[PDB]
Amino acid sequence: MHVEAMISKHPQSLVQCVEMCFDCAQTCAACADACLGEDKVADLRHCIRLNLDCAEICVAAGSIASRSILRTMLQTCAEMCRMCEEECRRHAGNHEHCRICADVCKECETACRSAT
Amino acid sequence: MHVEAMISKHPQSLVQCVEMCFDCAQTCAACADACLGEDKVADLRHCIRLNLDCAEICVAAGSIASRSILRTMLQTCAEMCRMCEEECRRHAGNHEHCRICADVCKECETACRSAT
Amino acid sequence: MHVEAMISKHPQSLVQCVEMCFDCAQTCAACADACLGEDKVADLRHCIRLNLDCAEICVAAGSIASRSILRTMLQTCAEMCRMCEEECRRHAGNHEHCRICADVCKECETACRSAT
Amino acid sequence: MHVEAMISKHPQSLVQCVEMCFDCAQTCAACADACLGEDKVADLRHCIRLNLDCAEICVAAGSIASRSILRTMLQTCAEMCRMCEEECRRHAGNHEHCRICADVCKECETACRSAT
Ligand SMILES: [Cu+]
Ligand SMILES: [Cu+]
Ligand SMILES: [Cu+]
Ligand SMILES: [Cu+]
Ligand SMILES: [Cu+]
Ligand SMILES: [Cu+]
Ligand SMILES: [Cu+]
Ligand SMILES: [Cu+]
Ligand SMILES: [Cu+]
Ligand SMILES: [Cu+]
Ligand SMILES: [Cu+]
Ligand SMILES: [Cu+]
Ligand SMILES: [Cu+]
Ligand SMILES: [Cu+]
Ligand SMILES: [Cu+]
Ligand SMILES: [Cu+]
Ligand SMILES: [Cu+]
Ligand SMILES: [Cu+]
Ligand SMILES: [Cu+]
Ligand SMILES: [Cu+]
Ligand SMILES: [Cu+]
Ligand SMILES: [Cu+]
Ligand SMILES: [Cu+]
Ligand SMILES: [Cu+]
Ligand SMILES: [Cu+]
Ligand SMILES: [Cu+]
Ligand SMILES: [Cu+]
Ligand SMILES: [Cu+]
Ligand SMILES: [Cu+]
Ligand SMILES: [Cu+]
Ligand SMILES: [Cu+]
Ligand SMILES: [Cu+]
Ligand SMILES: [Cu+]
Ligand SMILES: [Cu+]
Ligand SMILES: [Cu+]
Ligand SMILES: [Cu+]
Ligand SMILES: [Cu+]
Ligand SMILES: [Cu+]
Ligand SMILES: [Cu+]
Ligand SMILES: [Cu+]
Ligand SMILES: [Cu+]
Ligand SMILES: [Cu+]
Ligand SMILES: [Cu+]
Ligand SMILES: [Cu+]
Ligand SMILES: [Cu+]
Ligand SMILES: [Cu+]
Ligand SMILES: [Cu+]
Ligand SMILES: [Cu+]
Ligand SMILES: [Cu+]
Ligand SMILES: [Cu+]
Ligand SMILES: [Cu+]
Ligand SMILES: [Cu+]
Ligand SMILES: [Cu+]
Ligand SMILES: [Cu+]
Ligand SMILES: [Cu+]
Ligand SMILES: [Cu+]
Ligand SMILES: [Cu+]
Ligand SMILES: [Cu+]
Ligand SMILES: [Cu+]
Ligand SMILES: [Cu+]
Ligand SMILES: [Cu+]
Ligand SMILES: [Cu+]
Ligand SMILES: [Cu+]
Ligand SMILES: [Cu+]
Ligand SMILES: [Cu+]
Ligand SMILES: [Cu+]
Ligand SMILES: [Cu+]
Ligand SMILES: [Cu+]
Ligand SMILES: [Cu+]
Ligand SMILES: [Cu+]
Ligand SMILES: [Cu+]
Ligand SMILES: [Cu+]
Ligand SMILES: [Cu+]
Ligand SMILES: [Cu+]
Ligand SMILES: [Cu+]
Ligand SMILES: [Cu+]
């Protein structure tokens, strides 16, 4: 990622938040698709949905963070990540993709809470 | 828009919120580009930035609203729209694109506040 | 939508393309969620996936169209819409949400092909 | 990034493409804002615009790549990155943010061309 490089070269920490929003975005988008592909998919609906929302909010939060609504947006992104960690945590026993994503969600929650 | 058609045919008002999020998304994306094209662009930086953020948040809010983080997300989208109305309102005298967008922002703010 | 209002007030048809990209975006996002909620969800995986991709591409295509990659992007958005119409058409007999979305996809395909 | 972790744990190289799409997304979003903040902003309009489009296409391309339109989408994302490298390359002498972003664009172009 080039968050740090770019944030020092602009004419006018948070770095961690941005790295993580894009990381967590990609990851939940991956997890939605993985859950969608499972045989027990019918049981994963809420998880897929949350993953889709967490992807969307993290892209949004990370783009904004790359440029104020930011405080608010990072609170929201923190709330979302937590919702999505909790759900992805449930499935961590049976699905390795939800262990991986649940931890990425945890780390991005942390990162949004301390950015505010 | 087909928000209303689709929301009645799902196996499990808010309609207005969704219509407006996508409307206001496109509009602020249009306004960012219009301000970017102005001769007084150097004076419009904050407005362009807000427009970009309002586009991003409204897509995000509208997608989520099409599928919970929703309450929170709609509060955030309400806060953003207001921020962006206020700024786009400043420029309504001189720029017709900011009159149009400032009103779209007002109407979407309204719509998010009453969706919550 | 305010595509037409805004495109006439910028300091520097396609309108139909933009209206439709945002319409079709919201619609496929709605259809993904509707299919996700079906009992036969396990059979709808490819459709949900395509709907997610068509939502993403249409937002992208519509934002770009609101501001060149445009020709290319509209070809891609045309290809996607067609892929997603074809799949959503399959399910039009059994699911009213896929009849609605399959037609929105058809109309946006048309609109991208004639924008190029 | 957790592209690699997740792509091995799904029930059904490209990794490089995805890492890079999200990297290049964040970077061009950063560069748009940096150019927007420059005194010579009036001269950077085309660059800002391209950066905005490259951000949008790369998010889109990376999300899709995380889940077919993919071949097509990656061609488009390759075309965009190149357009945006070329423009960001122009400004590499005077602006360090455009040197950084022009190279991120180059590396993501490469990565999309070999993913296809
Ligand atoms: Cu973040
Ligand atoms: Cu996040
Ligand atoms: Cu985030
Ligand atoms: Cu995530
Ligand atoms: Cu998952
Ligand atoms: Cu899941
Ligand atoms: Cu998630
Ligand atoms: Cu997230
Ligand atoms: Cu988050
Ligand atoms: Cu997250
Ligand atoms: Cu999750
Ligand atoms: Cu899960
Ligand atoms: Cu999972
Ligand atoms: Cu998960
Ligand atoms: Cu996660
Ligand atoms: Cu997850
Ligand atoms: Cu998440
Ligand atoms: Cu976060
Ligand atoms: Cu964050
Ligand atoms: Cu809304
Ligand atoms: Cu809105
Ligand atoms: Cu909104
Ligand atoms: Cu707006
Ligand atoms: Cu504007
Ligand atoms: Cu403006
Ligand atoms: Cu706005
Ligand atoms: Cu907005
Ligand atoms: Cu809003
Ligand atoms: Cu708005
Ligand atoms: Cu505004
Ligand atoms: Cu303005
Ligand atoms: Cu304006
Ligand atoms: Cu405006
Ligand atoms: Cu506005
Ligand atoms: Cu505006
Ligand atoms: Cu707005
Ligand atoms: Cu709204
Ligand atoms: Cu709303
Ligand atoms: Cu379009
Ligand atoms: Cu479309
Ligand atoms: Cu489109
Ligand atoms: Cu669609
Ligand atoms: Cu559907
Ligand atoms: Cu479907
Ligand atoms: Cu679709
Ligand atoms: Cu589409
Ligand atoms: Cu399309
Ligand atoms: Cu479409
Ligand atoms: Cu479809
Ligand atoms: Cu379908
Ligand atoms: Cu359907
Ligand atoms: Cu469908
Ligand atoms: Cu459709
Ligand atoms: Cu559809
Ligand atoms: Cu579609
Ligand atoms: Cu279209
Ligand atoms: Cu189109
Ligand atoms: Cu990529
Ligand atoms: Cu890229
Ligand atoms: Cu890309
Ligand atoms: Cu980029
Ligand atoms: Cu830049
Ligand atoms: Cu630039
Ligand atoms: Cu770029
Ligand atoms: Cu890009
Ligand atoms: Cu690219
Ligand atoms: Cu790129
Ligand atoms: Cu560039
Ligand atoms: Cu540049
Ligand atoms: Cu630059
Ligand atoms: Cu640049
Ligand atoms: Cu770049
Ligand atoms: Cu750039
Ligand atoms: Cu780029
Ligand atoms: Cu790329
Ligand atoms: Cu790529």
Task: Please give, rounded to a whole number of angstroms, the shortest distance from the CA of C94 to a CA of chain D.
Answer: 23
Distance of alpha carbon D49 from its chain centroid, rounded?
13
Distance CA D27, CA D20 (A): 10
Q: CA D92 → CA A24, D51, D87, D106, distances in Å?
A: 30, 14, 9, 13
The residue assigned the tokens 């396609």 is C14
Distance CA C34, CA B46 (A): 39
Gap between the terminal Cα atoms of chain A: 21
> Cβ of A57 under 8 Å from any chain B Cβ?
yes
Token pair, residue A20, equals 């993580």
Distance CA A11, CA B80 (A): 24
Distance CA D51, CA D86 (A): 11
Indicate the SS3 state at residue C114.
helix
The pocket of ion ligand 7, defined by CB under 5 A, consists of A 28, 51, 54, 84, 105
CA–centroid distance, B30 to ligand 73, in Å, is: 21
Which of C55, C59, C100 is closest, CB to CB, to B6?
Answer: C100
Buried b (16+ CB within 10 A) or exposed e, D79-90: bbbbbbbebbbe
Angle CA(C83)–CA(C84)–CA(C89) in degrees, nearest 5? 105
Q: Are D61 and C76 in contact (CB under 8 A)?
A: no
Q: CA D88 → CA A65, B75, D77, distances in Å?
A: 21, 37, 16
The residue assigned the tokens 């660059």 is D47
Q: CA B14 → CA A76, C41, C104, distances in Å?
A: 19, 25, 21
Q: Are A94 and A111 in contact (CB under 8 A)?
A: no
Smallest Cα–Cα separation from B31: which of B99, B111, B110?
A: B99
Judging by beta carbons within 10 Å of its beta carbon (0-12, 13-18, 19+), is residue D94 exposed, middle or buried?
exposed
- The identity of residue A28, as a single letter, is C
Judging by beta carbons within 10 Å of its beta carbon (0-12, 13-18, 19+), is residue D52 exposed, middle or buried?
buried
Q: What is the DSSP-derived secondary structure letter of residue D4?
A: H
The residue assigned the tokens 């992805």 is A88
Q: Which domain holds residue D84?
A: 1-116
CA–centroid distance, B24 to ligand 31, in Å, is: 14
Distance CA A67, CA B49 (A): 7
Give the best residue of B21, B27, B48, B66 to mutate against chain C (max C CB count within 10 A). Answer: B66
| Nearest chain A residue to B65, by CA | A53
> Cβ of A69 under 8 Å from any chain C Cβ?
no
Judging by beta carbons within 10 Å of its beta carbon (0-12, 13-18, 19+), is residue C30 exposed, middle or buried?
buried
Q: What is the DSSP-derived secondary structure letter of residue D1?
A: -
- The identity of residue B99, as a single letter, is R
> Cβ of A84 under 8 Å from any chain D Cβ?
no
* Declared resolution, Å: 2.3
Token pair, residue A60, equals 């949004």
Distance CA C2, CA B58 (A): 15
Judging by beta carbons within 10 Å of its beta carbon (0-12, 13-18, 19+), is residue D40 exposed, middle or buried?
exposed
Smallest Cα–Cα separation from A60: which of C24, D67, D56, D45?
A: D56
Distance CA D25, CA D104 (A): 9
Structural domain count of chain A: 1
